[PDB]
Design a protein around this ligand. Structure first.
Ligand SMILES: N=C(N)NCCC[C@H](NC(=O)CNC(=O)[C@H]1CCC(=O)N1)C(=O)Nc1ccc(N(O)O)cc1
Length: 245
């Protein structure tokens, strides 16, 4: 995350930190995700497309720090890694960039809500909020596009939903952005998601409820003028989600 503020998992208790075991024993961070039901985390396909082997992945819930323990965290294995059949990546755009991780503990259990762990609601079919709405994003991604390391503490920030009208302008993204995506940026272009934040939540208030409206996907650079963050439009994938769940 570029700009914004450090936070803790209590303020984003649906946030799932996803890691990969390295054959040869080193574990590194992959991507964020969101707990949409006790047994299910949603994230982005492109996080996993290069190594689609469920056994190699670990999901943490209740975690506020990248490489150190948070009291109240819970570790899960991936019982099922479901990637989207029609995923594709072009020059920039990633299409159908959505994934599901069915999680279970070694002890056979799914997630249990606590002070640091709660589920997030899905939006209703095709129901988004209006352009101009303020939403929050969260993740362990880079604080600067140029950085070589990720921050050790979870960050979040606030961005605004942009109209497809605006995002499609040729000086923005033009054709690469579709109606299965959503653009969000700072009006002054000072804060954004970045490399390391993929799979994480874009969370907006919808009917009195914090709802998972988008999944961090792609952008050109991070926090660049006229290049908003692009997010998978959750409200357009409910049947996929419901089928595969
Ligand atoms: N909001 C803005 N402005 N940008 C969003 C960046 C999210 C980021 N997504 C991507 O990198 C997808 N690819 C890109 O964004 C390309 C296009 C622009 C660029 O410079 N790189 C991420 O964390 N990606 C990511 C990709 C792969 C992996 N591993 O797991 O495979 C992990 C993270």
């Amino acid at each position: 995350i570029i700009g914004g503020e450090f936070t803790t998992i209590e303020n984003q208790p649906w946030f799932a930190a996803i890691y990969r075991r390295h054959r040869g024993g080193s574990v590194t961070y992959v991507c964020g995700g969101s707990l949409i039901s006790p047994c299910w985390v949603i994230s982005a396909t492109h996080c996993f497309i290069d190594y689609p082997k469920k056994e190699d992945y670990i999901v943490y819930l209740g975690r506020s720090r990248l490489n150190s323990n948070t009291q109240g965290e819970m570790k899960f294995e991936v019982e099922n890694l479901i990637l989207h059949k029609d995923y594709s990546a072009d020059t920039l755009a990633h299409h159908n960039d959505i994934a599901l991780l069915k999680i279970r503990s070694k002890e056979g259990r799914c997630a249990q809500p606590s002070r640091t762990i709660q589920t997030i609601a899905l939006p209703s079919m095709y129901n988004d909020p209006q352009f101009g709405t303020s939403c929050e994003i969260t993740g362990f991604g880079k604080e600067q596009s140029t950085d070589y390391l990720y921050p050790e503490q979870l960050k979040m920030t606030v961005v605004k939903l942009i109209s497809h009208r605006e995002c499609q302008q040729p000086h923005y993204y033009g054709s690469e952005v579709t109606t299965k995506m959503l653009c969000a940026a700072d009006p002054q272009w000072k804060t954004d998601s970045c490399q390391g934040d993929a799979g994480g939540p874009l969370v907006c208030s919808l009917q009195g409820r914090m709802t998972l409206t988008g999944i961090v996907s792609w952008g050109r650079g991070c926090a660049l003028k006229d290049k908003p963050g692009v997010y998978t439009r959750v409200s357009h994938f409910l049947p996929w989600i419901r089928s595969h769940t």
